[PDB]
């Protein structure tokens, strides 16, 4: 069964991870051996089970997969626990130990994961560094795709990560996801800064129309920054394609010190923070 129907007893919400944008995520154990899992708690659930199947049918090393679902009073989404937490918090905590090699590789990995979703005709709708998880320092994965639509994202909100056409018309495409990719990259390059910090969400569409964009990160060469800016063009068709982003950042990954200037570039443990891996 691709989307395993789990019984209220097979798993248990041990601790709390964090209050998300669509629900609360817990850390826990699952017994179909005990497997560490992330549990997100948000008769007509036939609708959900549909968009839920998609989330479980993805198979790419850069995209999290939904492993199970529990349909009771509430819907609980069960996935494999990523021990290092989300990338946003990761870069914030290692702001002085993250080299250009890692930063570029993550951009490549996020780009591959996004290209994979585009091949499945799945618009994420909420890509951001907080929705990129760290399996290990050299392996990151995209998560939380599809939930946005499954709750009326484009029905009658992460404004600062959204493309202009999404804010004004609720239009979501793989190209609006490219814009958010641009913002996600900005978050990594600034080591976790909040985009448009100190600017009211209501004024965002206004500043974007006037041509204003997030500033060039200190460590970025104009070449890296040019890619981000292209991702934020009003004309969605003119923005880079994830496929082109994979190739461009891969190229830069071969000569990192040339595209990112990080002083001393070359040269808390999530054990006490956070049985067999779901992968096992
Ligand atoms: C501020 O710091 C917060 C740190 O929280 N880290 C949390 C977390 C984690 N350390 N490991 C794994 N998942 C984590 N969250 C998380 C994110 C999305 C989720 C679930 C469960 N269901 N869904 C929907 C979904 C949609 C599409 C594909 C999927 F696989 C899952 C859990």
From Swiss-Prot:
Belongs to the protein kinase superfamily. Tyr protein kinase family. EGF receptor subfamily. Residues 11-260 form the Protein kinase domain. Changing residue 8 to G: Found in a lung cancer sample; constitutively activated kinase with higher levels of basal autophosphorylation; more sensitive to gefitinib than wild-type. It is found in: Cell membrane; Endoplasmic reticulum membrane; Golgi apparatus membrane; Nucleus membrane. The modification Phosphotyrosine is found at residue 270. Changing residue 18 to A: Found in a lung cancer sample. Changing residue 124 to L: Found in a lung cancer sample; more sensitive to gefitinib than wild-type. Receptor tyrosine kinase binding ligands of the EGF family and activating several signaling cascades to convert extracellular cues into appropriate cellular responses. Known ligands include EGF, TGFA/TGF-alpha, AREG, epigen/EPGN, BTC/betacellulin, epiregulin/EREG and HBEGF/heparin-binding EGF. Ligand binding triggers receptor homo- and/or heterodimerization and autophosphorylation on key cytoplasmic residues. The phosphorylated receptor recruits adapter proteins like GRB2 which in turn activates complex downstream signaling cascades. Isoform 2 may act as an antagonist of EGF action. Phosphorylated on Tyr residues in response to EGF. Dephosphorylation by PTPRJ prevents endocytosis and stabilizes the receptor at the plasma membrane. Dephosphorylated by PTPN1 and PTPN2. Monoubiquitinated and polyubiquitinated upon EGF stimulation; which does not affect tyrosine kinase activity or signaling capacity but may play a role in lysosomal targeting. Polyubiquitin linkage is mainly through 'Lys-63', but linkage through 'Lys-48', 'Lys-11' and 'Lys-29' also occurs. Deubiquitination by OTUD7B prevents degradation. Ubiquitinated by RNF115 and RNF126. Ubiquitinated by ZNRF1 or CBL at different lysines in response to EGF stimulation; leading to recruitment of the ESCRT machinery and subsequent degradation in the lysosomes. The active site is at 126 (proton acceptor). ATP binds at residues 17-25, 40, 79-80, 144. Changing residue 147 to M: Found in a lung cancer sample. Changing residue 4 to A: Abolishes phosphorylation. This is Epidermal growth factor receptor. It is linked to Lung cancer: A common malignancy affecting tissues of the lung. The most common form of lung cancer is non-small cell lung cancer (NSCLC) that can be divided into 3 major histologic subtypes: squamous cell carcinoma, adenocarcinoma, and large cell lung cancer. NSCLC is often diagnosed at an advanced stage and has a poor prognosis. Neonatal nephrocutaneous inflammatory syndrome: An autosomal recessive disorder characterized by intrauterine growth retardation, premature birth, fragile skin, recurrent skin infections and sepsis, failure to thrive, nephrocalcinosis, and nephromegaly with tubular dysfunction. Some patients have chronic diarrhea, and necrotizing enterocolitis. There is a cross-link at residues 15, 43, 46, 156, 210, 241, 251 (Glycyl lysine isopeptide (Lys-Gly) (interchain with G-Cter in ubiquitin)). It comes from Homo sapiens. Binding of the ligand triggers homo- and/or heterodimerization of the receptor triggering its autophosphorylation. Heterodimer with ERBB2. Forms a complex with CCDC88A/GIV (via SH2-like regions) and GNAI3 which leads to enhanced EGFR signaling and triggering of cell migration; binding to CCDC88A requires autophosphorylation of the EGFR C-terminal region, and ligand stimulation is required for recruitment of GNAI3 to the complex. Interacts with ERRFI1; inhibits dimerization of the kinase domain and autophosphorylation. Part of a complex with ERBB2 and either PIK3C2A or PIK3C2B. The modification N6-(2-hydroxyisobutyryl)lysine is found at residue 40. Ubiquitously expressed. Isoform 2 is also expressed in ovarian cancers.
